[PDB]
Symmetry: D2
Subunit: 121 residues, 4 copies
């Protein structure tokens, strides 16, 4: 699948990803330091039998920003596709939802994008 490994976004984040034979994505977000206080679980899914016509591999994953040290009361989901080859990428759009009161729910979800590469920018 080409997805298992360490991935870097363009803005100082690291993700350790494992792609299981069944379509499972597992792993962690890690800080640049790699310390336990900044480590969070990721879980998601990917297409384990992509098209053989040059198409990318659809996927998504979530991190809830709680570990045994910190809780931001929020969760990010990334949706995108893996593209293999010499310039392998995961191109994604993300949504970050924060836990809010009902009055503030309308402004609970931020949107953005991330591009993941196998080496640093």
């Amino acid at each position: 699948a080409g997805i298992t490994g360490t991935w870097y976004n363009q803005l100082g984040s690291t993700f350790i990803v494992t792609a299981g034979a069944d379509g499972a994505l597992t792993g962690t977000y890690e800080s640049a330091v790699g310390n336990a206080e900044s480590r969070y679980v990721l879980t998601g899914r990917y297409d384990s039998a992509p098209a053989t016509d040059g198409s990318g591999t659809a996927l998504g994953w979530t991190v809830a920003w709680k570990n045994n040290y910190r809780n931001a009361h929020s969760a990010t989901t990334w949706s995108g596709q893996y593209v293999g080859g010499a310039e392998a990428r995961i191109n994604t759009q993300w949504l970050l939802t924060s836990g809010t009161t009902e009055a503030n729910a309308w402004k609970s979800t931020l949107v953005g994008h991330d591009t993941f590469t196998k080496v640093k920018p």
Copy 2:
């Protein structure tokens, strides 16, 4: 409050298990509950939400591949669980399809879903 069967008003059912560790697992099911339309979901939620009336942040992914069908796509939902008398999961979603590089710009749809524990009539 998250564990159980969630419905939108547009024909979808999700049977969700919320684990003590922050794991979301379960399935998408069609209205007829057939194996060909059943798909794995996995995600994460805040297992220690704020105690100030805020919702519980969460997200999950389904890759639309099972042993029968493969749409070469994946949906991620980002949102929050709101408890009380009329419990809800309020979400926004991204649907990414596997595409060629030329079509990657138009690979991600956006929308929203509102889920209830009450099966529609």
Copy 3:
């Protein structure tokens, strides 16, 4: 076109819209009180020759949240389609971008949805 008139979202907002023959959308956001302090200009575009196959009319508009009284340093864009008939609607997704420092730009854009009707909820 069926678009000119007063429109209400589901959450206490009013928009006064004019659809020009050339594809122009003009008008204002108005508060429930209709006072000048809460009035802001909207401008956008719509498809002035939609398909005749039951399809909706694509459109979009922007409000920058500055008037002579107030400035939130932000702007909302709505993207969607008008659907005519007895239950006429404008179904939209929105993005709200706030002016931020470069360090906070990643969290400058909120996403949501609005449904507009010709009468109050």
Copy 4:
């Protein structure tokens, strides 16, 4: 700083006029500048941004109809202008197509654009 010609790295040109009143007007142009590919843009921007290093919030819409072509669609861009040595407009976009009611759920694509005043080679 907004008035002028803006380019992405993906073949698009926008000639934007920022009026003293907060109006954005102008055109999309193709790389060959032909009339068949020219479309009106209109939007709004914050004409009195914060003086603390924050960007200038803005948005605009193009409905993809002119006297030659009609795609039955419209794009909205939401973002901010950032001045200085390498001025940019950083945006996220929504593209809504006119659809039947059955296809309305999949009528809106999401993405991002980064614009510069420097024409690509």
